[PDB]
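Hi L.,

As promised, N,N'-diacetylbacilliosaminyl-1-phosphate transferase:
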Amino acid sequence: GSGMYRNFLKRVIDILGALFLLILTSPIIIATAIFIYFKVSRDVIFTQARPGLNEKIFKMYKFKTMSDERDANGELLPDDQRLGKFGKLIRSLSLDELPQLFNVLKGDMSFIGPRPLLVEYLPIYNETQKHRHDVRPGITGLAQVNGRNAISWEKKFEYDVYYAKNLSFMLDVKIALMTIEKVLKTEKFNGKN
Ligand SMILES: [Mg+2]
């Protein structure tokens, strides 16, 4: 509600962590940007408009992995050829997700929180599920680690509202412990799925 973690510490940890991981992965960030510039597209970064804290829209950064080659007809060539071989390798290693660390540093996102979903889901949320945006979206979160017993979207949102209601340092540490434990490694919200 008004503790010093929800109103101060969590943001400070987000800033220190995003800054550290940006420096820690900076050679990979520069290398990935160089390859994409010469092999994929000279516009290295593209943004994804997503609703964030208080449903405020932000630009979620991501590396481009597909080309802009269309058919003279005007339509873009399918993903079959537009995704180079290295494009898969960048995707499989989630290297294109590294710019999201900057969204965390910007305050657009947190290290822990609900997943930033499509802007089309805003009218579909019910008044209970809309509380999922009472906190910053996260790279990981409570619903993300509970992907085994939550195949439906309403179960993931129940974890989202529960997280925004009970946001504490101990809950974040718990979510972080379960995320490491993931050492072991489609429908689209319709209002009833
Ligand atoms: Mg990826």
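Strands lie at 45-51, 57-63, 110-112, 138-140.

Thanks again for sending the construct details.

K.
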